[PDB]
Amino acid sequence: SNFLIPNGTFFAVLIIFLIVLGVISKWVVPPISKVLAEREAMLAKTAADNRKSAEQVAAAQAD
Amino acid sequence: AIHVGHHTLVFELFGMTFNGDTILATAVTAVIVIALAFYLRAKVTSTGVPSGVQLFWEALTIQMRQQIEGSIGMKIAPFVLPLSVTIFVFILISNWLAVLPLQYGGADGAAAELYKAPASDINFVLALALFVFVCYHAAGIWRRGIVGHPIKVVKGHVAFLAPINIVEELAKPISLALRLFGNIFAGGILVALIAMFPWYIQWFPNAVWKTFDLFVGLIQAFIFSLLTILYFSQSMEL
Amino acid sequence: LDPNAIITAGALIGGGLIMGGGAIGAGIGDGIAGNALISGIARQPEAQGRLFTPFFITVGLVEAAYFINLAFMALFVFATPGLQ
Amino acid sequence: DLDPNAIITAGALIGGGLIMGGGAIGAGIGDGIAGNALISGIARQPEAQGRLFTPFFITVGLVEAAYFINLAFMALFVFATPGLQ
Amino acid sequence: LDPNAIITAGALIGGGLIMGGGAIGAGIGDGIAGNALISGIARQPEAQGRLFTPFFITVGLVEAAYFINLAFMALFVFATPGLQ
Amino acid sequence: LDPNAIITAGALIGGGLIMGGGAIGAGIGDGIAGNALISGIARQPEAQGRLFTPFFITVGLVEAAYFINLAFMALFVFATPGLQ
Amino acid sequence: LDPNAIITAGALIGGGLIMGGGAIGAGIGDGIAGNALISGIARQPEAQGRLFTPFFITVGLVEAAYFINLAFMALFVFATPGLQ
Amino acid sequence: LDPNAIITAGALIGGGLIMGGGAIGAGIGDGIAGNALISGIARQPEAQGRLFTPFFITVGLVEAAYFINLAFMALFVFATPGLQ
Amino acid sequence: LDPNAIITAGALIGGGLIMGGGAIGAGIGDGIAGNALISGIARQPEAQGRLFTPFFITVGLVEAAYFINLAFMALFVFATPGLQ
Amino acid sequence: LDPNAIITAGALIGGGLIMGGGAIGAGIGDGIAGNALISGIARQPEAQGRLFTPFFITVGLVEAAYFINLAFMALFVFATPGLQ
Amino acid sequence: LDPNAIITAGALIGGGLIMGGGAIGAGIGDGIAGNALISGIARQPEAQGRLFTPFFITVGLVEAAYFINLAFMALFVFATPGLQ
Amino acid sequence: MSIFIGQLIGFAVIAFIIVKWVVPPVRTLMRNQQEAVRAALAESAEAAKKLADADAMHAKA
């Protein structure tokens, strides 16, 4: 009885959580953040590339 | 004969007892989460079409990153982004693996669950809530100095309400834990209660409650993660 | 008579009151939050994604007290304090 | 004297009645308020009718189910009275 | 002190609590829904036609609660569980 | 002691609770419906003539629920279930 | 112990509950109706008279419920049903 | 035991219920009416004189019930019906 | 068993009920009046000076209801009517 | 039996009533005042500094009464008047 | 009937009332503040960041009551004052 | 085992509900986001090709 009273499991469970966090900290979030940053950079580069293609065509016809 | 409590395969070590049932449930949750994480790490492509696991993980990351940016600059406190994310998935799994049909009769006419969500055990919620408590309080100490941070939290947004502010901080950890615990503890009774119904009638209320339990578990995981992020932001403002 | 019977009856009454209060609070708070969400969406039908966050924050904060009360009622009616 | 089972069952009945009363008050108030919001929304934006049914049913889902949760506990009190002798 | 007397007294008190709570909830919910409908009709005289369809749902989600509590009241006094 | 005495006392308490809840619900619901009606008339007067058609529906539920409670109170008080 | 004492105690508790609920309902409903009336008169003074018709249609109803309780409480305290 | 003790305790509890309900109703009604008055004066300062007449018409009603309720409390306590 | 014991227990319960109802009413009324004042001041700062005049009336009608309750609570506990 | 047992049971019940009523009132009043403050700040950000002046004036009026109740709770529980 | 049994029953009832009142107050306050926040966000998205500063402040008060009540609840059930 | 059969039927009903009502929309959202990412990649490739062709033309000019 007295289930609300904290037990020793408090310690053990915490340990496991840290383990998971470790992985999520080092092998889930950094790769995903890098992927998202690279995708946004790719989109911005696509926009800049379209603009520069328009500019270069305009210059070529001008010259 | 509801038979509330009665943690299974309990074991004593170093003079302290441990609910083996909660340990096993947490271990299964950790194994599933680590399996998903490594599946992502071994099959994440920045160039080609993303996979389902990568899509889910990046959706979670985008949600948490956007929440942080809205609350406190993601540049200022990067370490919040992983933690909260972790928390979310953890809670989510701990509230969804229960859906699996792992309830039977323990040769006594009382329901027995092979797997029970660890959040139904007070130790799980207390561990997570206390860890988050220490985490954002230490972050606030680092941000505003060892002496400054306690002073700032005691003062609060207005000096003359200093006493209530103290209560507020004392309510931050407890409110984080008990809520979650209840949201799952109730389930542990509900399903068990429905076990008293005849088998030919048990299916329908069981199905309805378990579906709503899926939804509630998702909601509670999201709330826990978001509240952790919000408390971090409140603790990391000058 | 049996003192434990009296203590158990008192615990049952206390737990019933705890659950009644918690349910009242949770129901009314959830109704108010849902009212805010629905009015906001009706005003701006394409704002669901933005509003769902604060609405769920409110739901969590309101249900915190209700489920704390549920946990305390479970304590009352399963591990009664002061029982002999 | 009297049977302690009598006191146990009387306390259980009173507790279950209280749980049901509180739950019904909460459910009625919440559902009425959410329905008022929905009715105003449909009045102002009929073309948005369907778009409103999504959030509303969440509120009801959070409210109605809460009531039903209390229902279970009442069934626990009356039929599976904890601490019975 | 017949045990059945205590059982029946507790059952009557519990049924009264059930009915009172259900009445409060149903009355206030119906009042609020009707206020919404009244405001909608006043603003938009022609909207009445549609406004009934959602209004009923509110009543359906409110009166039902009453019609549940009522049933449980019968489960208390008419057929009291645990009575001998 | 006379067990019927306890029976009647409990029944009277239950009926009082029934009527208290019913009166709370009826008062609040009628007040809210009347607020809606008065605001609707103030905003645009001549709609009064039609605004009664929905208003009476709202109150129609509210009073009805409360009036339902009335009957059951009598059942508790004048023909008490479980009385011997 | 006189059973009539138990009966009278139960009747007094029931009457107290009845008046408590009636007073709560009447106060809240009258306050809400008065708020509606005050807002209407502030917005549209020229229609003040037109508001007093629906307003009394509302308050009246609420008062009726309250006054109804007032009768039953008397029946509970003076002509207590079920006296031995 | 002494019937006077039981009857007095029941009467005291009933009177306490009466006064608590009356105070709740009066507080809510006064708050709501004052909110209406405050909003009206904020929007239309010149209406300060105009709005008092409806406001006092509201308060009175609300207050009336409370006082009436209070009166009966005395009847419960100082002139406890059925006392003996 | 001392009759004074039952009388004093009933008196304490009644006083607690009176105080609980009074506090509920006072708190909600003060909150509502303050909400009206806050909205009025937010709409235009210059209104502040005038707004406090009606506001103090509302609070005057709320706290008064509280204070009266307080007195009765004292009269219930310190000098219990019919203390016998 | 020991009359002090009944005395202390009644005192604990009365303190529970006091604290429950105070908590309900304080919570609802603070919530309503906070709703007013939040809406005001949303509409007029520049008023964030100004609105604090009345808001606290409200909160104290809400808190004062509540805290007063808390004080009396001690009087009921720790040093119970009428204890013997 | 051991005195401690009666004291424990009374303490459990008192704690139950304290928790019920605190839960209702916290839930209503949280819901109201959340409704204000949701409306503020729906109207003005850019205000979201600056709406948490006042919102939580009010929430900081709303919890203060409930949890404080909870604290005293722990005194009732575990460290029951006056326990023999 | 009776309660086991009951909860098994309940889980089967839940699975049927998920597959009929939930799986199609979630799969559709995942497919839509995958298609969006593929379209973004194709846009990047086409933009690079556009730059190459424009540079070639400019060199010709």
Side-chain angles (χ1 to χ4, degrees):
Chain A
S1 86
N2 293 318
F3 53 79
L4 187 153
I5 305 305
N7 203 357
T9 290
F10 176 81
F11 270 82
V13 62
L14 182 43
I15 278 157
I16 289 155
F17 168 70
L18 277 296
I19 299 306
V20 161
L21 177 58
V23 163
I24 297 275
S25 89
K26 307 313 183 188
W27 299 328
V28 167
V29 170
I32 284 281
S33 282
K34 265 179 79 180
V35 160
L36 291 168
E38 282 186 351
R39 194 175 296 154
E40 304 219 358
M42 189 215 62
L43 198 51
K45 174 264 275 170
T46 285
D49 181 338
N50 285 322
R51 300 272 293 289
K52 187 269 183 182
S53 286
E55 183 178 1
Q56 198 58 255
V57 169
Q61 60 175 3
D63 301 301
Chain B
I2 183 65
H3 281 197
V4 163
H6 314 152
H7 283 104
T8 61
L9 72 165
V10 173
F11 66 93
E12 68 89 13
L13 287 174
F14 300 129
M16 271 293 128
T17 179
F18 307 89
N19 296 315
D21 189 358
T22 297
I23 300 299
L24 170 54
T26 306
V28 163
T29 299
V31 169
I32 290 282
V33 167
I34 288 158
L36 291 177
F38 278 124
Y39 197 68
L40 177 137
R41 197 209 90 192
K43 301 290 158 177
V44 66
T45 66
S46 158
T47 75
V49 300
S51 79
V53 176
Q54 188 202 358
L55 288 153
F56 157 57
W57 276 113
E58 66 183 1
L60 266 176
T61 310
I62 288 290
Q63 289 298 111
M64 296 314 164
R65 210 194 68 216
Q66 201 149 355
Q67 299 273 21
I68 289 156
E69 290 154 78
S71 192
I72 179 61
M74 172 56 204
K75 184 142 201 192
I76 295 90
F79 55 78
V80 171
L81 175 56
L83 171 50
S84 72
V85 163
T86 309
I87 288 283
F88 186 107
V89 163
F90 212 59
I91 305 309
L92 189 145
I93 301 293
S94 294
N95 309 349
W96 276 15
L97 270 165
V99 69
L100 305 181
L102 305 167
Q103 176 172 229
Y104 77 117
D108 69 339
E113 316 293 319
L114 313 179
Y115 169 87
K116 181 71 207 69
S120 73
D121 204 1
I122 190 71
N123 294 292
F124 169 98
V125 303
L126 261 177
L128 276 71
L130 178 138
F131 175 79
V132 163
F133 175 93
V134 174
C135 275
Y136 66 87
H137 270 300
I141 291 168
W142 158 74
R143 184 76 165 168
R144 319 212 277 273
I146 276 163
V147 71
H149 171 69
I151 294 163
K152 183 69 201 210
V153 301
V154 168
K155 293 166 76 169
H157 274 91
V158 293
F160 66 93
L161 285 179
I164 278 171
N165 298 128
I166 293 159
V167 171
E168 188 170 356
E169 64 154 51
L170 270 49
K172 270 178 204 305
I174 287 154
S175 64
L176 272 158
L178 284 181
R179 176 216 282 113
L180 173 62
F181 157 85
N183 290 318
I184 311 312
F185 172 87
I189 292 159
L190 271 293
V191 172
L193 184 134
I194 297 144
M196 294 182 286
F197 266 99
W199 64 271
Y200 42 85
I201 296 144
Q202 164 164 321
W203 55 274
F204 153 68
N206 190 278
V208 166
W209 172 244
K210 286 188 88 159
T211 302
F212 184 69
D213 195 352
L214 270 70
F215 284 138
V216 161
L218 170 56
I219 292 151
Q220 294 323 307
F222 171 86
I223 292 306
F224 205 65
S225 83
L226 182 60
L227 285 176
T228 299
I229 294 154
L230 197 146
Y231 291 150
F232 265 110
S233 83
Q234 270 179 12
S235 167
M236 294 182 286
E237 261 166 0
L238 317 181
Chain C
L1 60 92
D2 213 328
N4 295 300
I6 279 166
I7 284 162
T8 302
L12 279 165
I13 287 155
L17 283 173
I18 294 156
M19 271 325 278
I24 281 162
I28 302 171
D30 295 343
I32 291 156
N35 175 1
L37 180 84
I38 298 156
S39 174
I41 279 158
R43 184 169 219 292
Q44 213 290 342
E46 297 291 327
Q48 280 142 317
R50 178 167 72 271
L51 291 166
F52 264 117
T53 290
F55 158 75
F56 275 119
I57 293 168
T58 292
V59 161
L61 279 72
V62 65
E63 293 179 353
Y66 162 55
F67 278 90
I68 291 156
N69 279 251
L70 198 158
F72 269 107
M73 181 275 257
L75 185 151
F76 267 31
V77 304
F78 297 130
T80 311
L83 190 72
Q84 302 148 228
Chain D
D1 296 344
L2 73 165
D3 192 24
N5 188 4
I7 292 284
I8 293 274
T9 292
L13 277 158
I14 288 161
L18 270 170
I19 298 158
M20 279 315 85
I25 290 162
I29 304 287
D31 293 358
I33 290 159
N36 161 23
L38 183 140
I39 291 155
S40 282
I42 277 166
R44 195 56 261 164
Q45 296 221 3
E47 48 186 60
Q49 160 167 228
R51 293 175 173 77
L52 292 164
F53 268 115
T54 286
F56 168 64
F57 281 128
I58 301 305
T59 311
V60 163
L62 280 163
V63 160
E64 160 178 349
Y67 181 76
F68 266 92
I69 282 149
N70 272 38
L71 198 154
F73 284 100
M74 182 265 279
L76 177 141
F77 276 32
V78 186
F79 301 103
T81 307
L84 194 62
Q85 298 171 36
Chain E
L1 323 179
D2 188 346
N4 284 9
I6 289 280
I7 303 313
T8 298
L12 287 151
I13 289 165
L17 286 159
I18 295 167
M19 285 298 327
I24 292 163
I28 300 182
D30 283 1
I32 292 159
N35 163 18
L37 170 61
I38 290 282
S39 180
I41 279 167
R43 299 291 180 90
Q44 292 265 34
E46 191 64 288
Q48 180 179 26
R50 55 165 174 286
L51 281 165
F52 282 129
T53 287
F55 162 68
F56 284 140
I57 292 170
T58 309
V59 161
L61 277 296
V62 170
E63 211 66 0
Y66 203 69
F67 271 41
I68 294 162
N69 273 27
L70 193 59
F72 277 121
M73 189 280 296
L75 183 134
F76 268 43
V77 304
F78 267 32
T80 313
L83 183 66
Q84 291 73 16
Chain F
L1 185 57
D2 196 320
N4 289 315
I6 298 153
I7 299 301
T8 293
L12 261 69
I13 286 162
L17 272 189
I18 290 167
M19 185 63 72
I24 284 163
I28 292 160
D30 283 18
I32 294 157
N35 170 4
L37 180 72
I38 295 159
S39 182
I41 282 162
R43 183 176 175 85
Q44 190 274 332
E46 66 170 37
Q48 182 193 347
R50 63 183 167 90
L51 266 174
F52 287 140
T53 300
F55 166 84
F56 286 139
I57 276 163
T58 299
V59 164
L61 313 180
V62 159
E63 78 192 275
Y66 158 76
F67 272 115
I68 290 280
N69 266 30
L70 189 76
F72 285 92
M73 181 177 77
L75 174 63
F76 274 34
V77 177
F78 288 110
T80 312
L83 182 75
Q84 52 257 26
Chain G
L1 71 166
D2 190 342
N4 284 318
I6 300 283
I7 299 303
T8 315
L12 281 157
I13 290 160
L17 287 167
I18 293 159
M19 293 298 102
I24 283 163
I28 296 171
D30 282 358
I32 286 157
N35 162 22
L37 175 54
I38 292 152
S39 296
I41 283 169
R43 287 190 68 267
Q44 190 96 21
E46 293 172 354
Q48 152 171 36
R50 265 169 159 171
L51 300 168
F52 270 107
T53 286
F55 168 73
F56 290 128
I57 284 156
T58 296
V59 162
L61 282 170
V62 167
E63 289 298 312
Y66 173 85
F67 267 117
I68 286 281
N69 277 15
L70 203 47
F72 277 102
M73 191 216 68
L75 165 62
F76 272 29
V77 305
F78 304 117
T80 302
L83 294 174
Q84 303 295 102
Chain H
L1 74 167
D2 190 340
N4 273 343
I6 298 292
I7 182 61
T8 309
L12 265 62
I13 288 159
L17 265 48
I18 294 165
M19 262 303 267
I24 297 154
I28 303 283
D30 292 358
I32 297 282
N35 175 306
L37 182 64
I38 287 281
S39 280
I41 280 164
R43 295 302 212 288
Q44 190 84 264
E46 190 277 331
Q48 183 174 356
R50 172 164 86 270
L51 298 190
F52 272 117
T53 286
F55 172 76
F56 289 124
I57 288 158
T58 297
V59 165
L61 278 156
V62 168
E63 214 62 10
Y66 169 86
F67 279 173
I68 294 159
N69 220 22
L70 161 55
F72 278 99
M73 188 284 311
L75 165 60
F76 268 42
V77 180
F78 300 105
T80 309
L83 179 54
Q84 44 81 11
Chain I
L1 71 166
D2 200 336
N4 282 333
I6 286 280
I7 288 145
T8 295
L12 288 167
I13 293 159
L17 294 148
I18 292 160
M19 195 49 39
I24 293 157
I28 301 164
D30 276 354
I32 292 160
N35 162 20
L37 173 70
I38 285 280
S39 296
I41 279 163
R43 289 287 179 272
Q44 59 270 50
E46 56 264 44
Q48 171 150 353
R50 53 168 160 130
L51 277 178
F52 273 93
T53 293
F55 172 89
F56 283 133
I57 288 162
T58 305
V59 175
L61 294 174
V62 172
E63 304 310 299
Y66 191 67
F67 284 165
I68 284 163
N69 263 28
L70 183 65
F72 279 96
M73 186 190 69
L75 172 145
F76 270 42
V77 308
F78 290 98
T80 300
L83 181 50
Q84 159 166 331
Chain J
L1 273 293
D2 196 350
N4 281 295
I6 289 277
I7 297 298
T8 291
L12 273 154
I13 292 153
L17 276 298
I18 290 154
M19 281 315 327
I24 281 165
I28 297 170
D30 271 315
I32 292 158
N35 170 5
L37 185 74
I38 292 154
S39 290
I41 291 169
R43 259 62 168 274
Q44 307 94 327
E46 311 95 334
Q48 188 183 352
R50 168 167 88 272
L51 298 176
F52 273 43
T53 289
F55 165 68
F56 298 138
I57 279 161
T58 290
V59 159
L61 296 163
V62 161
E63 289 290 352
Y66 162 77
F67 262 67
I68 281 165
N69 265 21
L70 173 47
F72 269 96
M73 183 278 288
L75 177 72
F76 267 38
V77 180
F78 297 113
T80 313
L83 186 68
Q84 73 212 19
Chain K
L1 280 76
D2 182 299
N4 286 5
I6 313 312
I7 303 309
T8 303
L12 280 153
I13 285 165
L17 280 77
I18 294 161
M19 281 335 288
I24 291 161
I28 305 283
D30 273 18
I32 296 283
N35 168 301
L37 180 75
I38 293 153
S39 294
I41 276 164
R43 307 269 149 155
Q44 287 292 345
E46 68 253 11
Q48 187 272 343
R50 87 201 154 77
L51 286 175
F52 282 5
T53 292
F55 165 86
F56 275 97
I57 283 164
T58 62
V59 183
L61 291 157
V62 171
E63 301 146 80
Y66 167 56
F67 279 92
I68 278 166
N69 271 252
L70 192 145
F72 285 103
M73 191 226 78
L75 193 82
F76 269 35
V77 311
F78 301 116
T80 306
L83 187 68
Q84 310 309 318
Chain L
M1 301 265 158
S2 67
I3 55 165
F4 174 83
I5 287 283
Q7 61 85 33
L8 195 83
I9 296 167
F11 175 73
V13 161
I14 296 160
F16 177 76
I17 286 155
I18 278 162
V19 299
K20 188 135 198 68
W21 288 51
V22 165
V23 176
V26 159
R27 182 188 273 197
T28 291
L29 293 174
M30 295 208 164
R31 195 73 56 174
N32 275 345
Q33 184 177 2
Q34 283 192 353
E35 189 67 12
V37 177
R38 197 217 63 74
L41 267 297
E43 293 264 31
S44 164
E46 289 306 290
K49 203 177 285 181
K50 259 183 187 164
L51 188 153
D53 269 15
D55 186 74
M57 190 264 277
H58 193 81
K60 181 190 92 204

